[PDB]
């Protein structure tokens, strides 16, 4: 049975009762216990706000993307919000339980699969630059300043992904990638990662 | 599943959405696709949601009424909007005889295209019928729809003192709109002598 959807009086119904997304079809509606359900990737069109979906962690973000950060063991270490600004994305990060000192902090190219930080790949580098904000041949769009962790093991910071975008399908789109916190300090000059070393925490940027 | 709104956690305590006086899972996985309740996400952005069973329509932001004739053909559509003075109705209809047609909010939903089942005019303030009656009027009383030679109505009208707020005396949610065969004379109890019911639709809730 066809369910119809109107938004402020305008028809948003699908033509055949199917929702299409990245070359897959799904029924556009399920009714269960009297409640109407729609696919997660359809519900932006119905609520007039961007809807971000992190499939492996089953996290929906409305408005601002949320990044949940985990250690290698799958335990929560903190979170971050992203917000689009002029020619960048503003990252507001909270983290706890990290070793005091400076930690390398970057957007990596790939999503983390199965909680294995090696799967994140290298730094997000759509402009084909060398690593480092202090490098004359820098920098990766993914490069941020070190996360400064206190004696208490905590960090709170606002970093900018310079030239990053939350818009979909753009060379500098940071949606559907990852944030990685390193064990070591980023020296701001050395390829590929500022001599940042191991990946101690990370999380997926929804899309 | 987890829900965040502009960065704050809005997740449910136990994975259940409270709706319709029952619980539904705050998500459903069907054949590799994650479904979420339209009402939970719309509620999180502050956008109202309404449902109408006969038309199987979800109305987001403002109610849409689908109008049908006795044969069950779609003959038009109305949007309802909350205003200071009541509820604004913007209506389009086709298939009507040229001339003036009575147009009212009736007290009940239409049960399966039986327009009699809509009952009388919505009358929460216990007045007489008619916008020209010194003892009027029903909250459900609107002016006549003027239908051209083409059989088409297009009008903007106010349900005076009506409301889309829930659980108020003058709530029009879950009632009906009826278009009559005849002209509403604006005076005669109980329906202005507007005669038969020729089209109608249920107001979402
Ligand atoms: Cu890195
Ligand atoms: Cu009537
Ligand atoms: Zn880099
Ligand atoms: Zn009346």
Numbering used by the authors:
A (entry chain A): 14 to 220
B (entry chain B): 16 to 220
Pull text from the paper.
pmcMost aerobes ranging from prokaryotes to eukaryotes are equipped with Cu/Zn-superoxide dismutase (CuZnSOD), which facilitates the disproportionation of superoxide into hydrogen peroxide and molecular oxygen. A structural significance of the S–S bond in CuZnSOD is to tether a loop to the protein core and thereby shape an entry site of the substrate O2− leading to the catalytic copper ion.
Furthermore, PaSOD was found to form a homodimer through the N-terminal domain with a novel protein fold. PaSOD-1CTD was found to bind a copper and zinc ion, the positions of which were determined based upon the anomalous scattering data collected at wavelengths 1.373 Å (Cu signal) and 1.275 Å (Cu and Zn signals). Reduction of the S–S bond is known to significantly decrease the conformational stability of both hSOD1 (21) and EcSodC; therefore, we wondered how PaSOD-1 lacking the S–S bond maintains the interaction between loop IV and the β8 strand. Moreover, Asp52 in loop IV of hSOD1 points outward but is replaced with Ile174 pointing inward in PaSOD-1, where a hydrophobic cluster (Ile174, Gly176, Gly177, Phe179, Gly264, and Gly265) is formed between loop IV and β8 strand.
